[PDB]
Design an enzyme around this catalytic site. Sequence first.
Site, PDB file in Angstrom:
ATOM      1  N   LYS A   1       4.495  -1.973   1.844  1.00  0.00           N
ATOM      2  CA  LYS A   1       5.557  -1.684   0.849  1.00  0.00           C
ATOM      3  C   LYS A   1       6.985  -2.103   1.392  1.00  0.00           C
ATOM      4  CE  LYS A   1       2.641  -0.134  -2.096  1.00  0.00           C
ATOM      5  NZ  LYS A   1       2.479  -0.726  -3.632  1.00  0.00           N
TER       6      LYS A   1
ATOM      7  N   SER B   1      -3.216  -3.475   4.731  1.00  0.00           N
ATOM      8  CA  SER B   1      -2.064  -2.960   4.028  1.00  0.00           C
ATOM      9  C   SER B   1      -1.391  -2.024   4.832  1.00  0.00           C
ATOM     10  CB  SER B   1      -2.365  -2.901   2.516  1.00  0.00           C
ATOM     11  OG  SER B   1      -3.259  -1.845   2.492  1.00  0.00           O
TER      12      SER B   1
ATOM     13  N   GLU C   1       9.406   6.390  -7.513  1.00  0.00           N
ATOM     14  CA  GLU C   1       8.416   7.290  -7.528  1.00  0.00           C
ATOM     15  C   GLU C   1       7.275   6.707  -6.572  1.00  0.00           C
TER      16      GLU C   1
HETATM   17  C1  LIG Z   1       1.008   3.555  -4.293  1.00  0.00           C
HETATM   18  C2  LIG Z   1       1.410   3.480  -2.954  1.00  0.00           C
HETATM   19  N1  LIG Z   1       0.814   2.784  -1.986  1.00  0.00           N
HETATM   20  C3  LIG Z   1      -0.216   2.018  -2.436  1.00  0.00           C
HETATM   21  C4  LIG Z   1      -0.825   1.235  -1.377  1.00  0.00           C
HETATM   22  C5  LIG Z   1      -1.602   0.244  -1.654  1.00  0.00           C
HETATM   23  C6  LIG Z   1      -1.928   0.136  -3.307  1.00  0.00           C
HETATM   24  O1  LIG Z   1      -0.699  -0.512  -3.863  1.00  0.00           O
HETATM   25  P1  LIG Z   1      -0.625  -2.080  -4.108  1.00  0.00           P
HETATM   26  O2  LIG Z   1      -1.886  -2.319  -4.918  1.00  0.00           O
HETATM   27  O3  LIG Z   1       0.540  -2.449  -4.857  1.00  0.00           O
HETATM   28  O4  LIG Z   1      -0.546  -2.855  -2.847  1.00  0.00           O
HETATM   29  C7  LIG Z   1      -2.301  -0.595  -0.633  1.00  0.00           C
HETATM   30  N2  LIG Z   1      -2.189  -0.246   0.484  1.00  0.00           N
HETATM   31  C8  LIG Z   1      -1.391   0.719   0.965  1.00  0.00           C
HETATM   32  C9  LIG Z   1      -1.019   1.000   2.516  1.00  0.00           C
HETATM   33  C10 LIG Z   1      -0.635   1.459   0.075  1.00  0.00           C
HETATM   34  O5  LIG Z   1       0.265   2.584   0.119  1.00  0.00           O
HETATM   35  C11 LIG Z   1       2.851   4.576  -2.647  1.00  0.00           C
HETATM   36  O6  LIG Z   1       3.006   4.688  -1.377  1.00  0.00           O
HETATM   37  O7  LIG Z   1       3.404   5.126  -3.705  1.00  0.00           O
END
Ligand SMILES: C=C(/N=C/c1c(COP(=O)(O)O)cnc(C)c1O)C(=O)O
Lengths: 377, 249
Positions: A86, A359, A108
């Site tokens: 992120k 991730s 958010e």
């Molecule tokens: C939704 C969040 N994060 C999601 C997340 C995700 C899923 O979000 P994306 O599909 O946009 O990568 C994947 N990997 C990690 C480490 C994540 O923290 C948040 O921190 O608000």
Amino acid sequence: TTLLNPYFGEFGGMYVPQILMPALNQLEEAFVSAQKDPEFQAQFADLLKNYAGRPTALTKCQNITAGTRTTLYLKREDLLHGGAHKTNQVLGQALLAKRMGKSEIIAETGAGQHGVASALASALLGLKCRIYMGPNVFRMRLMGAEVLKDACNEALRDWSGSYETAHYMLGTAAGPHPYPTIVREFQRMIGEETKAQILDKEGRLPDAVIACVGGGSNAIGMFADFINDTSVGLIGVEPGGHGIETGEHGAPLKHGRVGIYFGMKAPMMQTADGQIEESYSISAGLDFPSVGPQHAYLNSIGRADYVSITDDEALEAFKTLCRHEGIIPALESSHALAHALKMMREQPEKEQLLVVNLSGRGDKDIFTVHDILKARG
Amino acid sequence: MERYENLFAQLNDRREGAFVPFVTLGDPGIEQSLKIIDTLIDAGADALELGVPFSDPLADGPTIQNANLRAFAAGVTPAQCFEMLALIREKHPTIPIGLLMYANLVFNNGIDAFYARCEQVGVDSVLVADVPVEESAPFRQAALRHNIAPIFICPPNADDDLLRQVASYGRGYTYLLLIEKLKEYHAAPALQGFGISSPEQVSAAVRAGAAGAISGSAIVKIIEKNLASPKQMLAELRSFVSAMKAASR
Ligand SMILES: C=C(/N=C/c1c(COP(=O)(O)O)cnc(C)c1O)C(=O)O
Ligand SMILES: [Cl-]
Ligand SMILES: [Cl-]
Ligand SMILES: [Cl-]
Ligand SMILES: [Cl-]
Ligand SMILES: [Cl-]
Ligand SMILES: [N+]
């Protein structure tokens, strides 16, 4: 009128109240300008290198694949400052906010990673950051931030008559144009580095790159530079929760219907009469009732394949990585690793070179995993 | 039908403006919503704007958001809203009835089928809150095919391009938050819907050249205050609507 196409096939668009279109048009114009500005690119590169820690490592996993013909690499976004991918795109969006002469940030967050990402970027760049609907809470406050599907509805509310001063820092590759495009372009160094790294180590492109999918930002970041490499498989992994058959999951792309919500036309989980349903996952970061429109598009044309992984499969992959590579992965990321482990274990004499986008790191998840392990015994 | 055109022709003959209240359908419940709506018509509303409860009301302020949870807390579904609408129209043959919708409820089971159902129950207009004019084509077209006026929001910032798009694309009335350029571009009669809370604001909008005023949250306020007092709800609603409409004459 827009400079860029707001749609990926039939998916995407700008389905917001008329009063927010000037904000979206302003943002798109600034982004297009910034992408052609060598000074902007140099400042973003500076932040990513010297503050976030890019490039991130690509780690080979020989212990996990021993006795199979799978070679597995992990792209180590868990080593990025803040602990997840992120951070990449909040740094870019914070620079875009400053390019537009703005000094407040609205955000958010579900898993806290993006809210803390928004807070750290705002602290570094001198922006006043206000977060809606988030441990993670104390981090954001430490970093000077004034602190749910409705979370995504909290900020739009303020950004209404705010965008002259503030910027809405959307946290995934979803929402109204231009956000799916901006978030992809500010995450695509994930795949760019992975390609260069795999080439250096293996002399060839991966057979498949595998990433978990909530809204879709880490996956599209990994996928983007491989889309035109037709031999590279693109596998996105949605949360199966307790099982698709239970309805308690977060896999709209597979088991859902197209609708219009959160400013976009995209697959979503919804009732028969079009109310937006609640998703579920052991991992808060995948607990999202829809998916970014480029993933819906890539699926529809068959360029990317989307699968699901249950809570229990994700938990086993989390334990496997801890014990055999000494890396504690985010439970979100463990969904992608779990699918790779399945590709290997189901066909252990299949020769395949796989990259899993790790991730994020899973320090945030150790309490959750501890309670499940103890409740099991 | 041509309820909006007949209404504005009649109001012009009487040299007065329109007052149009908004209420959420099924707030606080189907029975009392039906009685609330009859009270508004009794008190002298010239048209109605009615909301269908939606899981995520993105474009609603705090007062409007509470109305929807009250309706969901009552079990109100879109199908029940359309039976309500048919019952309202069967009691009141000429008052214009506009819906304020969110896009997913319109798109869910087919855009054309939604506007067909609106025509069947006698709805006159649909404003889709999260469809900007740039995205509106399939909604406008389906609306016009079923004799439904597509309503567009003309925001305060609107440049000339948006003005001519709103003027060309909307029917029934123009939702205003400018008046001369809309008249110049032959727009649908404008209804001011920005902060309409006092009889003076109604009179000030008609005097500005608007055809009338929409009070998008003041009615919802009066309902929220008298939940444990249904009778006094209707009497407070009646007095306020009467004060607003008298301000239009
Ligand atoms: C939704 C969040 N994060 C999601 C997340 C995700 C899923 O979000 P994306 O599909 O946009 O990568 C994947 N990997 C990690 C480490 C994540 O923290 C948040 O921190 O608000
Ligand atoms: Cl274009
Ligand atoms: Cl450049
Ligand atoms: Cl290169
Ligand atoms: Cl009538
Ligand atoms: Cl018409
Ligand atoms: N999701």
